[PDB]
Amino acid sequence: PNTSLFVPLTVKPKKVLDKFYKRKEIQKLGADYGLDARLFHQAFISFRNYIMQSDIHIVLNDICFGHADFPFFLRHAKQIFPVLDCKDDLRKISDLRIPPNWYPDARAMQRKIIFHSGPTYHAIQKYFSAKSGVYCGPLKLLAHEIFEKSNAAGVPCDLVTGEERVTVQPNQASHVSCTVEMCSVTTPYEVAVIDEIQIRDPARGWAWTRALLGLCAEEVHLCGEPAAIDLVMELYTTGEEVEVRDYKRLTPISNLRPDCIVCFSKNDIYSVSRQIEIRGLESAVIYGSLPPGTKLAQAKKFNNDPLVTDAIGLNLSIIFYSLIPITTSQALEVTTMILKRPVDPIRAAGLHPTAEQIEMFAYHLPDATLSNLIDIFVDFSQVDGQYFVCNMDDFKFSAELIQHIPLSLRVRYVFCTAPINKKQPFVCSSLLQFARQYSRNEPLTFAWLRRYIKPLLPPKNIKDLMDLEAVHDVLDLYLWLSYRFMDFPDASLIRDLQKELDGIIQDGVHNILIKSETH
Amino acid sequence: PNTSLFVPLTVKPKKVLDKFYKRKEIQKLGADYGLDARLFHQAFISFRNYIMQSDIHIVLNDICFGHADFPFFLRHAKQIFPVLDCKDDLRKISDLRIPPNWYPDARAMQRKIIFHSGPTYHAIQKYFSAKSGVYCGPLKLLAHEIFEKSNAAGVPCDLVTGEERVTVQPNQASHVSCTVEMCSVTTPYEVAVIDEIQIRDPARGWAWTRALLGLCAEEVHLCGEPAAIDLVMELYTTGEEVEVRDYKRLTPISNLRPDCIVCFSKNDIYSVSRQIEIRGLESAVIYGSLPPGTKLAQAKKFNNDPLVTDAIGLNLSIIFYSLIPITTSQALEVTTMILKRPVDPIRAAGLHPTAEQIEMFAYHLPDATLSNLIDIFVDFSQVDGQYFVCNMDDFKFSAELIQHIPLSLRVRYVFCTAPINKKQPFVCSSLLQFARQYSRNEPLTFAWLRRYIKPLLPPKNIKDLMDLEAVHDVLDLYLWLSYRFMDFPDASLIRDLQKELDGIIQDGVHNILIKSETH
């Protein structure tokens, strides 16, 4: 309980008061109840300012005229800091021990865990065949990949992403691809594929742990680097049997051979592209900010036609311009115009604060802000050794941004759990807008949304593209929430408005605007 | 016994263990004793984890070196789930059959049941005249109505509500108005009026059934819709004679004629009021959240002066803005800017778990939570055909809220039986507070209560009013418990502190703040 977290509540309204404070007896008795150096102080200074600048009067009159040893102090001190009043209560609410309890159906079941080690398409096959299955995808692509494959290859696939939810069945279908966040924990499945189990992400590990411990499957297929094995070995508290099946690199490796250039700067991508079209030849570009369409159409054109930074970790058949140092976890001839050290095995999986935990922390500490509540939660939290609490840094920011909009805990919880890029001014602006009108009970229709986003103009230089992509993002935000707060009614319509923009973007993406330089 | 309810108790501490589990002989022998799919599993997995990660050693050594068929398993399985050990015992404790037994004095007596059908003031008259009588009111108004009438019209009336208990007699008086919950079952009466007998409420039916079957009267007067008749016909197990006496609507019916607008949104009430004062004219407002004073003073002013959602079902002499669909049970020219279908007759009356039942379920299942105990109770419960078990949904919530506060079954029972609105954050906060200090043996005095509720400031917009009304609620909560746990000593004092607020509220209620809109 680092008290730096506890902001004092302003409880607005001389001889012995000074002595009472100095007295190492009172100082110790204070510390006994939880009052440290800073707490005992702030408590006294407002206890003094309260008495003088304004029941107790009986004992007040009776110490004036001749003990001097505290409970009236502590009554004040506890309306200053309500923490102290419920320390024991908060600890229990943030006890995140024996996580495998939180999903009892996974415990109710016989589950076989199978781990396809190696630095894929077997598991993919094993659930196509499976009577009832599920995919759990890391990105918002690999989910679509399997959505397109399965339903076509003759095993219908539903899609549950954050931003899309599609039912193929003209009537709930019996197979679904999803982002690991969206994967059920109550729906009985037969085989489940948790792709990319590395659960180690300091901000996203939570959803993996969730999937690992909670999927109501009968076979649980993992696919991820052999460094992760140690962890799943003990994850055995749930009492299931681990099976490893190491795979290997078909061919290994440590110029412009028709080659892949990988940067770390969006400056370098807006540079190298220059370099290439200087010597006539024509380059592709894949930055993570590229709409999902223009990503594909720029990857497929490289896969008929005569790679330029985003960690490439879809199907792409194929040099570091910069090494800045590097996470020593990047994968792939690849020159430096790396495996120097061994990969440290993985230690702990990831948990995060729930809504409901925080809604309880709210009832205890009702004056605290979200940002602060989560900081308070994290403090009292209790993790078993093979788990860690995720970094809720984005969760907070999103909360410091909408703090003034008069929402309610639950709603406010969801809004700040929406995936935004801070470094995009228009998105943040937009979050506030979306949040502000909800409070005003002002449903955000296709009309409203059309005027707000301004049917955009074809891009010219690399600011317009940036704006357009943010205008893309803004639309994705509207969709993300459309599935949580929908009363955001014109969800389907926006996807259409979004779908042209994707091309209006692609248009400009082939024709790179990177020369900005001229003007 | 849906096993989803039975949470396994963590009983913390290889060849044949695997075979023993697979063996359909063991699997069946397990199921014989009550172990279903999920139960037999969880039991084995912790039986395996117990043996290996840690008497039995004799049989353990003796199967190693060459039958393999169970009782050691079942000893473990039953310290996992204590349910199994006392299934038969629990059933009997939750057998709610032949309810008319539970009140033997009603059986000891000659009782005549009379049913004033029709979609009132006769029964009201019949007990005024009665030497010893009782009223059983649905709301916390109709109880006060009769308390004011009787004692004045020259037949003294005591009041027993949840939140008030008043003796008029300067010395136990011989006549009482009450909420149906508070009505005795041991006090000998002559005539009893059970107003609004529709006993069908999925959460409140219990107290009606109680009154119907338990009032020690000589004439039992019912007043309620003719759909309820079928039920009271068989409620004849008690062996009394039913008398129907259908009444009718003096005048029937299917614009701003000096008219009544009825909404279903608190948004619409904060809207229509705008609409009315736009065209100069002046509107009344009655929302159910309005203190009992400001309800009257806003109904009387409409009943001298030149209706705006809460189901109006006190004396009010007089259009649906929304129909959302509708319960097809709403009553009343009434336009839609309804009787489309017939009313389905009523099927079953209502019972609920008692404290003492649960205090017994606690002695069997001492590790279960309240919320879960009641779910367990409901499961094993045994209802005769013309009764149903109420929805204890609020009872649970109130219990999930105070779960961490170290109270005792009885007390904890009462706290979560206190009437609160979940959707009011301050009330829930307050419940915890009231509950927390009881545990700390810290009686909640008028002083403590005064600082907590902060002598509030006149309202400005419609948040202050909401807060004030919750501050009202909080005070009502303090009173409700004041009559159960009183050691809450300053009951009378709070009612006074409450009584000014009622006006501080009324002040703001006439002067609607609804334009919030401007700011």
mmCIF file of C-alpha atoms in Angstrom, chain A residues 12-181:
data_model
loop_
_atom_site.group_PDB
_atom_site.id
_atom_site.type_symbol
_atom_site.label_atom_id
_atom_site.label_comp_id
_atom_site.label_asym_id
_atom_site.label_seq_id
_atom_site.Cartn_x
_atom_site.Cartn_y
_atom_site.Cartn_z
ATOM 1 C CA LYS A 12 -13.325 21.234 5.298
ATOM 2 C CA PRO A 13 -14.327 22.574 8.784
ATOM 3 C CA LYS A 14 -3.678 24.719 19.335
ATOM 4 C CA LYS A 15 -1.469 24.112 22.374
ATOM 5 C CA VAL A 16 -1.823 20.361 22.909
ATOM 6 C CA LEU A 17 -2.519 19.751 19.200
ATOM 7 C CA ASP A 18 1.174 20.593 18.581
ATOM 8 C CA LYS A 19 2.297 18.332 21.451
ATOM 9 C CA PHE A 20 -0.059 15.467 20.473
ATOM 10 C CA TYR A 21 1.562 15.433 17.028
ATOM 11 C CA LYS A 22 5.123 15.494 18.383
ATOM 12 C CA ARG A 23 4.395 12.730 20.930
ATOM 13 C CA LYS A 24 6.059 9.530 19.640
ATOM 14 C CA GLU A 25 3.268 7.649 21.447
ATOM 15 C CA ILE A 26 0.563 9.104 19.179
ATOM 16 C CA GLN A 27 2.961 8.864 16.210
ATOM 17 C CA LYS A 28 3.322 5.124 16.843
ATOM 18 C CA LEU A 29 -0.357 4.480 17.632
ATOM 19 C CA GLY A 30 -1.175 6.186 14.320
ATOM 20 C CA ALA A 31 1.288 3.967 12.412
ATOM 21 C CA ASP A 32 -0.290 0.911 14.070
ATOM 22 C CA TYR A 33 -3.574 1.539 12.207
ATOM 23 C CA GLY A 34 -1.813 2.162 8.884
ATOM 24 C CA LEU A 35 -0.794 5.839 9.088
ATOM 25 C CA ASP A 36 2.755 6.152 7.719
ATOM 26 C CA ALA A 37 4.942 9.274 7.670
ATOM 27 C CA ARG A 38 2.999 11.118 4.969
ATOM 28 C CA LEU A 39 -0.410 9.810 6.081
ATOM 29 C CA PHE A 40 -0.109 10.659 9.782
ATOM 30 C CA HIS A 41 1.054 14.133 8.740
ATOM 31 C CA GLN A 42 -1.625 15.079 6.196
ATOM 32 C CA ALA A 43 -4.186 13.662 8.634
ATOM 33 C CA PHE A 44 -2.968 15.804 11.556
ATOM 34 C CA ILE A 45 -2.561 19.012 9.512
ATOM 35 C CA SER A 46 -6.186 18.791 8.354
ATOM 36 C CA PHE A 47 -7.238 17.624 11.834
ATOM 37 C CA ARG A 48 -5.668 20.821 13.233
ATOM 38 C CA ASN A 49 -7.090 22.978 10.428
ATOM 39 C CA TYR A 50 -10.477 21.328 11.023
ATOM 40 C CA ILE A 51 -10.669 21.870 14.795
ATOM 41 C CA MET A 52 -9.421 25.471 14.767
ATOM 42 C CA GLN A 53 -11.101 26.900 11.641
ATOM 43 C CA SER A 54 -14.467 25.482 12.769
ATOM 44 C CA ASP A 55 -19.692 16.208 20.027
ATOM 45 C CA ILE A 56 -15.902 16.460 20.353
ATOM 46 C CA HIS A 57 -16.403 19.767 22.201
ATOM 47 C CA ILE A 58 -16.758 17.798 25.464
ATOM 48 C CA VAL A 59 -13.244 16.305 25.305
ATOM 49 C CA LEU A 60 -12.043 19.553 23.720
ATOM 50 C CA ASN A 61 -13.139 21.550 26.789
ATOM 51 C CA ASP A 62 -11.812 18.874 29.177
ATOM 52 C CA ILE A 63 -8.194 18.716 27.973
ATOM 53 C CA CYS A 64 -7.994 22.539 27.985
ATOM 54 C CA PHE A 65 -8.426 22.670 31.768
ATOM 55 C CA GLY A 66 -6.225 19.642 32.565
ATOM 56 C CA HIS A 67 -4.831 12.545 29.465
ATOM 57 C CA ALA A 68 -4.103 13.917 25.981
ATOM 58 C CA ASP A 69 -3.680 10.556 24.218
ATOM 59 C CA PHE A 70 -6.502 9.910 19.455
ATOM 60 C CA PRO A 71 -9.835 8.291 18.317
ATOM 61 C CA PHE A 72 -11.271 11.674 17.270
ATOM 62 C CA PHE A 73 -8.095 12.131 15.186
ATOM 63 C CA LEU A 74 -8.596 8.706 13.587
ATOM 64 C CA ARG A 75 -12.258 9.464 12.778
ATOM 65 C CA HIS A 76 -11.021 12.501 10.834
ATOM 66 C CA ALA A 77 -8.023 10.621 9.378
ATOM 67 C CA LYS A 78 -10.405 7.977 7.995
ATOM 68 C CA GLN A 79 -12.741 10.464 6.342
ATOM 69 C CA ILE A 80 -9.556 11.901 4.852
ATOM 70 C CA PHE A 81 -8.418 8.504 3.571
ATOM 71 C CA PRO A 82 -11.237 5.887 3.250
ATOM 72 C CA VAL A 83 -8.590 3.327 2.254
ATOM 73 C CA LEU A 84 -7.678 2.689 5.901
ATOM 74 C CA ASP A 85 -11.301 1.904 6.681
ATOM 75 C CA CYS A 86 -11.391 -1.033 4.242
ATOM 76 C CA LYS A 87 -7.778 -2.087 3.545
ATOM 77 C CA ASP A 88 -8.655 -5.682 4.498
ATOM 78 C CA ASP A 89 -11.762 -5.509 2.299
ATOM 79 C CA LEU A 90 -9.859 -4.247 -0.752
ATOM 80 C CA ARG A 91 -7.151 -6.953 -0.549
ATOM 81 C CA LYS A 92 -9.736 -9.743 -0.948
ATOM 82 C CA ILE A 93 -11.421 -8.084 -3.934
ATOM 83 C CA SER A 94 -8.044 -7.867 -5.703
ATOM 84 C CA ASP A 95 -6.899 -11.408 -4.762
ATOM 85 C CA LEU A 96 -6.172 -12.974 -8.152
ATOM 86 C CA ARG A 97 -4.906 -16.307 -6.845
ATOM 87 C CA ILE A 98 -5.501 -19.760 -8.311
ATOM 88 C CA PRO A 99 -6.832 -18.121 -11.526
ATOM 89 C CA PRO A 100 -8.046 -21.549 -12.851
ATOM 90 C CA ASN A 101 -10.913 -21.186 -10.372
ATOM 91 C CA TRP A 102 -12.438 -18.206 -12.238
ATOM 92 C CA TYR A 103 -13.452 -20.526 -15.064
ATOM 93 C CA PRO A 104 -15.166 -23.495 -13.364
ATOM 94 C CA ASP A 105 -16.454 -25.157 -16.556
ATOM 95 C CA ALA A 106 -12.865 -25.678 -17.682
ATOM 96 C CA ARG A 107 -12.455 -27.405 -14.312
ATOM 97 C CA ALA A 108 -15.771 -29.273 -14.740
ATOM 98 C CA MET A 109 -14.339 -30.778 -17.921
ATOM 99 C CA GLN A 110 -11.702 -33.208 -19.091
ATOM 100 C CA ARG A 111 -9.293 -31.095 -21.130
ATOM 101 C CA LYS A 112 -6.237 -32.241 -23.071
ATOM 102 C CA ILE A 113 -3.619 -29.572 -23.702
ATOM 103 C CA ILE A 114 -1.384 -29.984 -26.747
ATOM 104 C CA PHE A 115 1.480 -27.576 -27.544
ATOM 105 C CA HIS A 116 2.836 -27.300 -31.115
ATOM 106 C CA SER A 117 6.268 -25.906 -30.185
ATOM 107 C CA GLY A 118 8.752 -24.496 -32.719
ATOM 108 C CA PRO A 119 10.090 -21.082 -33.910
ATOM 109 C CA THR A 120 0.464 -24.243 -37.334
ATOM 110 C CA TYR A 121 -1.523 -25.899 -40.131
ATOM 111 C CA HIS A 122 -1.834 -29.159 -38.170
ATOM 112 C CA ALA A 123 -3.961 -27.551 -35.453
ATOM 113 C CA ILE A 124 -5.702 -25.584 -38.227
ATOM 114 C CA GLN A 125 -6.576 -28.954 -39.789
ATOM 115 C CA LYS A 126 -7.511 -30.625 -36.513
ATOM 116 C CA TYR A 127 -10.389 -28.208 -35.840
ATOM 117 C CA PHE A 128 -11.625 -28.012 -39.438
ATOM 118 C CA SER A 129 -12.266 -31.739 -38.987
ATOM 119 C CA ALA A 130 -13.501 -31.181 -35.409
ATOM 120 C CA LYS A 131 -17.288 -31.291 -34.980
ATOM 121 C CA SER A 132 -17.214 -28.082 -32.900
ATOM 122 C CA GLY A 133 -14.129 -25.863 -32.810
ATOM 123 C CA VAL A 134 -12.698 -22.369 -32.243
ATOM 124 C CA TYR A 135 -9.728 -20.300 -33.398
ATOM 125 C CA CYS A 136 -8.138 -17.729 -31.035
ATOM 126 C CA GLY A 137 -6.196 -15.202 -33.116
ATOM 127 C CA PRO A 138 -3.569 -12.622 -31.965
ATOM 128 C CA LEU A 139 -4.148 -9.960 -34.649
ATOM 129 C CA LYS A 140 -7.280 -8.763 -36.457
ATOM 130 C CA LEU A 141 -6.147 -10.591 -39.619
ATOM 131 C CA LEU A 142 -5.329 -14.216 -38.749
ATOM 132 C CA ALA A 143 -8.947 -14.237 -37.534
ATOM 133 C CA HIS A 144 -10.195 -13.277 -41.018
ATOM 134 C CA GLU A 145 -7.739 -15.691 -42.661
ATOM 135 C CA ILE A 146 -9.382 -18.645 -40.889
ATOM 136 C CA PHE A 147 -12.839 -17.135 -41.347
ATOM 137 C CA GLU A 148 -12.315 -17.188 -45.136
ATOM 138 C CA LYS A 149 -10.612 -20.606 -45.283
ATOM 139 C CA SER A 150 -12.878 -22.768 -43.107
ATOM 140 C CA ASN A 151 -16.298 -21.604 -44.337
ATOM 141 C CA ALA A 152 -15.073 -22.065 -47.930
ATOM 142 C CA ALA A 153 -13.199 -25.368 -47.467
ATOM 143 C CA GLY A 154 -16.636 -26.616 -46.410
ATOM 144 C CA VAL A 155 -16.832 -26.098 -42.628
ATOM 145 C CA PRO A 156 -18.879 -22.924 -41.839
ATOM 146 C CA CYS A 157 -17.041 -20.296 -39.776
ATOM 147 C CA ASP A 158 -18.546 -17.386 -37.825
ATOM 148 C CA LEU A 159 -16.450 -14.306 -37.032
ATOM 149 C CA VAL A 160 -16.211 -12.681 -33.611
ATOM 150 C CA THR A 161 -13.707 -9.823 -33.582
ATOM 151 C CA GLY A 162 -13.944 -6.694 -31.463
ATOM 152 C CA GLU A 163 -15.048 -4.705 -34.520
ATOM 153 C CA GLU A 164 -16.956 -7.341 -36.535
ATOM 154 C CA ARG A 165 -19.444 -10.059 -35.547
ATOM 155 C CA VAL A 166 -20.828 -12.101 -38.472
ATOM 156 C CA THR A 167 -23.193 -15.091 -38.673
ATOM 157 C CA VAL A 168 -22.926 -17.057 -41.933
ATOM 158 C CA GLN A 169 -25.889 -19.321 -41.081
ATOM 159 C CA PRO A 170 -29.100 -17.847 -42.629
ATOM 160 C CA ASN A 171 -30.997 -18.845 -39.472
ATOM 161 C CA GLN A 172 -25.562 -19.667 -33.921
ATOM 162 C CA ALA A 173 -23.161 -21.685 -36.117
ATOM 163 C CA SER A 174 -20.896 -24.440 -34.749
ATOM 164 C CA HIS A 175 -17.493 -22.950 -35.603
ATOM 165 C CA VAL A 176 -15.930 -19.519 -35.035
ATOM 166 C CA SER A 177 -12.692 -17.634 -35.585
ATOM 167 C CA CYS A 178 -12.013 -14.871 -33.076
ATOM 168 C CA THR A 179 -9.508 -12.611 -31.415
ATOM 169 C CA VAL A 180 -8.278 -14.213 -28.184
ATOM 170 C CA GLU A 181 -10.166 -11.489 -26.306
#
